[PDB]
Paper text:
The apo-state structure of the full-length sqTRPV1 shows at least nine well-resolved densities of annular lipids per channel subunit. In the apo state, the same residues contribute to the binding of PI, which resides deeper in the vanilloid site towards the linker domain and pushes away the side chain of tyrosine Y513. Strong density in the middle of the cap, which we interpreted as a chloride ion coordinated by arginines R624, represents a likely barrier for cation conductance along the central axis of the channel. The cryo-EM density for the cap is relatively weak and is completely missing for residues 608–617. As a result, the intracellular skirt of full-length sqTRPV1 is less dynamic than that of truncated rTRPV1. Indeed, the entire skirt is well-resolved in the cryo-EM density of full-length sqTRPV1, while density for two peripheral of the six ankyrin repeats, as well as the C-terminal hook domain preceding the third strand of the three-stranded β-sheet in truncated rTRPV1 was missing. Other than these differences, apo-state structures of sqTRPV1 and rTRPV1 are quite similar, suggesting that whenever the complete termini are present in rTRPV1, they are likely to interact with the rest of the protein in the same way as in sqTRPV1.
Transient receptor potential (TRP) channels are polymodal molecular sensors involved in numerous physiological processes and implicated in a variety of human diseases. Here, we present structures of the full-length thirteen-lined ground squirrel [name] solved by cryo-EM. Our structures resolve the extracellular cap domain formed by the S5-P-loops and the C-terminus that wraps around the three-stranded β-sheet connecting elements of the [name] intracellular skirt.
Residue numbers in the entry:
A (entry chain A): 283 to 607, 618 to 779
B (entry chain B): 564 to 607, 618 to 704
C (entry chain B): 283 to 422
Write the structure that this text describes.
């Protein structure tokens, strides 16, 4: 059409993931492929792209069409002359155990619109992003991309970032204190190590800056709602803004360099919670930390700060100046509490557990001062904090499955971003496809498709299949093809 | 009582280990940023509010003073030997919100989930402990 | 075989505790015992050990095969000339109330590879350790 959608593309943009719509669309997607082979077999229908350059499998991943995605990646077609259109094969079947082969033609990152890359780099307006990696090829593909060539690269990145923060801690713990921020290099072994730790601190701050620029401009053209999608790359970029902003305040003869180095230091250890993904039970834990900040702590800290600024306004309005210029120093704060900042600080201490409840006496009407404090402790400490624990209790029950799937997407972005770092590793990133033969094409040529291998077992259906590739079972670097192939 | 202590085991291994990693990352993270702020005395002067006239310039003292926020004894004005009072309180408020408000109250919720899922399992682990 | 597994040992290491696999393995474990009594009754098939010294009941406890374990300890065989292969008997039945007897041949700690000792002293890599003590002899 004018969009460029063929018949198979239009079946994708029709399906809306419901149980009835998935049933016939994947049935109609089958019958048109089978008709597409019988009418003229020389044309591969799934290679046809629209004007957005998307194949019908890449279109199902670009939108949230999981039921079409689950069908294409697991497509078994039993009819001869149409066996080559299958994307799932079995290479042997010895009784109960049979070994399935999933084709990896456009997926597995070597192509341009690879659906593993299309899912993980989506813009969060597309539905079912966390669920599309749970289809049976894409889960085992990422897990075995994790178990070799990535988890040793990821544990190295977590080893350097711990060594980065230990250097940036020690270079900031032992910062000079004598005067203006351009400090002279004293010829000691300590100040040599101190300025070595500062050069390694800025060079990391340049690195997370340039890693954030290439996320914003070079790779991943981000929308305005995508800055509130990827929270991790903002947190590493905002850290590098405090680190590079420290260097600007360093050479500008300003002692405010320590006010920005400190914000880079507290946020830098807070960004150690990035690397706690890849560990499964710890990575699900930090996804739940995210969903407590966004869902339960944002709803708390609005109603809390409305109650905090509300009652502290009413306490300052009560309390006057000293007016008796006299009192024994109980803990000795003889203080003008007449600031709004001091009272908001003294009502925050009720939330911690350090609320004084007699923090001043410079008022009149002792009754309405305690009634304000008691209505504050009941509304905030008794009600609102204990309600936050209950609302965190509900959220854990409802995201208990979701946080496992958001983590597998967080690990998937790490797996794909690792492969983008090296063109040499991309030739290693062929995930076990081995260039296996899966039968014969029309014209009777060898098929030779990259196939991920999955071992399975069934104790009720014994798999006397029409198309089985190897007559001899297993894989021992010795192959033998089956004569049941028409070609 | 035996099912109760099997649940104590499954809170230490499953929920307290996941807590005390992210807690000690937040504790050592913000206490590093507080020590980096605070200097020596530099005024050698102040009325003894509870009388700790102290060099808080140790990393151990600040990690001890940020641990007290978790107990309920966090001072929140535990030193004055700094500059930039704004970024000192913003560090403490971001610590109390991340640890006391968020992370402790989340630990109670995650202990709430674990009790629901090990309610049958802890009875069977106990019968193995008795066996 | 080279491992030492007989036919009943191999039925144990095949079963993987699922609902369909438990159903026929314990059905096949029955039919081979019944054939094992009819062909030559002088040989007790469950006393045969492999090269790890495990009986077919001790092998089901050494691994996590709970469904084979739940079957052997509660095995009632109704056919005469095969009643002696049962491990669960009833000694009396007065109307509604009947008194069941569970055999304690290799279990109850007096033997060397007693399955009550084998389950409780497992190395935690074996599945279903906490659930294997919930079969009806081993709990009571
Ligand atoms: C002033 C001084 C204070 C300094 C320290 C405080 C410093 C400030 C507070 C940080 C507390 C965070 C805890 C550890 C951060 C490290 C985790 C991380 O680094 O980030 C993870 C999610 O951070 C989040 O909790 C951010 C919560 C919202 C904070 C506001 C953000 C504005 C900017 C992982 O999120 P991610 O970026 O990986 O994206 C996921 C996925 O990939 C996407 O596809 C989507 O599915 C989406 O759901 C994400 O789950
Ligand atoms: C790895 C295991 C991790 C576990 C723990 C990690 C190790 C822990 C510790 C490690 C080092 C600290 C212990 C030294 C004790 C005496 C120092 C001292 O105080 O003397 C002088 C400072 O001397 C300095 O400047 C300190 C050196 C700073 C180096 C910063 C980068 C380190 C890596 C470099 C490149 C890496 C390559 C080379 C790698 C070998 C005088 O001190 P002051 O400035 O006058 O006073 C400061 C005031 N204050 C102290 C009250 C705040
Ligand atoms: C010199 C100074 C630098 C120090 C170097 C230390 C950093 C560099 C070290 C990098 C290597 C760390 C790897 C350790 C684990 C071994 C790998 C493994 O397979 O085990 C597994 C268990 O692992 C866990 O579940 C534990 C969770 C650990 C999370 C925090 C890391 C602690 C590192 C130390 C403290 C950090 C330091 C904090 C700041 C200083 C991980 O895999 P899994 O997914 O969990 O399970 C598989 C899935 N399954 C359940 C289905 C089976
Ligand atoms: C000062 C201390 C602050 C501490 C915490 C601050 C931490 C950072 C705060 C950053 C700003 C808050 C926005 C969060 C991130 C934006 C992205 C987003 O979509 O929002 C959230 C939407 O989730 C919700 O809609 C439920 C919560 C309602 C928002 C609460 C706003 C109140 C003030 C808030 C400020 C409080 C303080 C200001 C008081 C005046 C993200 O949830 P989601 O899972 O991605 O999508 C769910 C889809 N759904 C909407 C259909 C369910
Ligand atoms: C300092 C105060 C510490 C207080 C608490 C320390 C108490 C002692 C801590 C001892 C060390 C921790 C290991 C516990 C015992 C080892 C045995 C084991 O298998 O682990 C646990 C695995 O359970 C999990 O996998 C979930 C939790 C992930 C581990 C958290 C590591 C973070 C740092 C941790 C250190 C924090 C402090 C360090 C901070 C840098 C046992 O669980 P399981 O039921 O037997 O098996 C579940 C199987 N599953 C994996 C498939 C689900
Ligand atoms: C106790 C002693 C302490 C003192 C000594 C320490 C001296 C020097 C210490 C630290 C040096 C400072 C490095 C600054 C660079 C940034 C740091 C960083 O974490 O970024 C990257 C580092 O990944 C890399 O590897 C980048 C290359 C770094 C140089 C290689 C160092 C190897 C030294 C090790 C040799 C030992 C083992 C050798 C093997 C036998 C990783 O981050 P990311 O995941 O890519 O992106 C962030 C996530 N994001 C995508 C959301 C944004
Ligand atoms: C999302 C954010 C990303 C933005 C990245 C930006 C990176 C750019 C880097 C630095 C930008 C700004 C930081 C330091 C610059 C001013 C320092 C300062 O003067 O402190 C002021 C407030 O300082 C603050 O509170 C600033 C808050 C920064 C953001 C905190 C959000 C939480 C307080 O100053 P003072 O108390 O009046 O000083 C008197 C003390 N004296 C006279 C004795 C000297
Ligand atoms: C976790 C958080 C708790 C931690 C505590 C942090 C809380 C921070 C709280 C306050 C910021 C701190 C700075 C001000 C206090 C110090 C100076 C002072 O005494 O006040 C001065 C300013 O006057 C005011 O403070 C404003 C007057 C009423 C407040 C109106 C705010 C409207 C709501 C806004 C929306 C908020 C609603 C939010 C709801 C979601 C008055 O004194 P002065 O006489 O003018 O000075 C003499 C010099 N002169 C005469 C030359 C000028
Ligand atoms: C959602 C929940 C919000 C509920 C809000 C909190 C509910 C809390 C639960 C229970 C209520 C207790 C609240 C505070 C107790 C007041 C007594 C007191 O403070 O002593 C003062 C007495 O001041 C007086 O004048 C006597 C009290 C009169 C008003 C009290 C209203 C209480 C009911 C409303 C409810 C101090 O004494 P004095 O200053 O020396 O004055 C004596 C002068 N005279 C001799 C003339 C009298
Ligand atoms: C529940 C827990 C809370 C309880 C609190 C317990 C917390 C314990 C915290 C600390 C241990 C206590 C001992 C040290 C403090 C006393 C001495 C001192 O002042 O510092 C000294 C050492 O210098 C340092 O302390 C190191 C400098 C930066 C820290 C780098 C650690 C890297 C991360 C590592 C991984 C951790 C990451 C973990 C994340 C999971 C500096 O003083 P000095 O000038 O050198 O001394 C003069 C003498 N001289 C000149 C002759 C040498
Ligand atoms: C995930 C959640 C993390 C959120 C973090 C915490 C959020 C908490 C909620 C709300 C924010 C309240 C935080 C602390 C209040 C700052 C005011 C203060 O401390 O008083 C200081 C004012 O110092 C100043 O310079 C004025 C404040 C400027 C920066 C404040 C940024 C607040 C927004 C960021 C958010 C003390 O006064 P002074 O020292 O005498 O300086 C006066 C000099 N002058 C006349 C030149 C100005
Ligand atoms: Cl005194
Ligand atoms: Na207290």
């Amino acid at each position: 059409d004018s969009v460029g959608n063929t018949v198979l593309h239009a079946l994708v943009e029709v399906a809306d993931n419901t149980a009835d719509n998935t049933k016939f669309v994947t049935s109609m997607y089958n019958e048109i492929l089978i008709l597409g082979a019988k009418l003229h077999p020389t044309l591969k229908l799934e290679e046809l792209i629209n004007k957005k350059g998307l194949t019908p499998l890449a279109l199902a991943a670009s939108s949230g069409k999981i039921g079409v995605l689950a069908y294409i990646l697991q497509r078994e077609i039993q009819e001869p002359e149409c066996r080559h259109l299958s994307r799932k094969f079995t290479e042997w079947a010895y009784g109960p155990v049979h070994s399935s082969l999933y084709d990896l033609s456009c997926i597995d990152t070597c192509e341009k619109n690879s659906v593993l890359e299309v899912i993980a780099y989506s813009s969060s307006e597309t539905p079912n992003r966390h669920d599309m990696l749970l289809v049976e090829p894409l889960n085992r593909l990422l897990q075995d991309k994790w178990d070799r060539f990535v988890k040793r690269i990821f544990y190295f990145n977590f080893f350097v970032y711990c060594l980065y923060m230990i250097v940036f801690t020690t270079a900031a713990y032992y910062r000079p204190v004598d005067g203006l921020p351009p400090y002279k290099l004293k010829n000691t072994v300590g100040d040599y190590f101190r300025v070595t730790g500062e050069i390694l601190s800025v060079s990391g701050g340049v690195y997370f800056f340039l890693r954030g620029i290439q996320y914003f401009l070079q790779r991943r053209p981000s929308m305005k709602t995508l800055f509130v999608d990827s929270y991790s790359e903002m947190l590493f970029f905002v850290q590098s803004l405090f680190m590079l902003g420290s260097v600007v305040l360093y050479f500008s003869h300003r002692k405010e360099y320590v006010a920005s180095m400190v914000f880079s230091l507290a946020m830098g250890w807070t960004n150690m919670l990035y690397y706690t993904r890849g560990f499964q039970q710890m990575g699900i834990y930090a996804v739940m930390i995210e969903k407590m900040i966004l869902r339960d702590l944002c709803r708390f800290m609005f109603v809390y700060l409305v109650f905090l600024f509300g009652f502290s306004t009413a306490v300052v309005t009560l309390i006057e100046d000293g007016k008796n210029y006299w009192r024994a120093p109980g803990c000795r704060p003889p203080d003008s509490y007449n600031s709004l900042y001091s009272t908001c600080l003294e009502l925050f201490k009720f939330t911690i557990g350090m609320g004084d409840l007699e923090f001043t006496e410079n008022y009149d009407f002792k009754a309405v001062f305690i009634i304000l404090l008691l209505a504050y402790v009941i509304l905030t400490y008794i009600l609102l904090l204990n309600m936050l624990i209950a609302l965190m209790g509900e959220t854990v029950n409802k995201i208990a499955q979701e946080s496992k799937n958001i983590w597998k997407l967080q690990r998937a972005i790490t797996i794909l971003d690792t492969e983008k770092s090296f063109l040499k590793c991309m030739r290693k990133a062929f995930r076990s496809g081995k260039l296996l033969q899966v039968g014969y094409t029309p014209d009777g040529k060898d098929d030779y498709r990259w196939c991920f291998r999955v071992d399975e077992v069934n104790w009720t259906t014994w798999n006397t299949n029409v198309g089985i590739i190897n007559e001899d079972p297993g894989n021992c670097e010795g192959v033998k093809r089956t004569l049941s192939f028409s070609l």
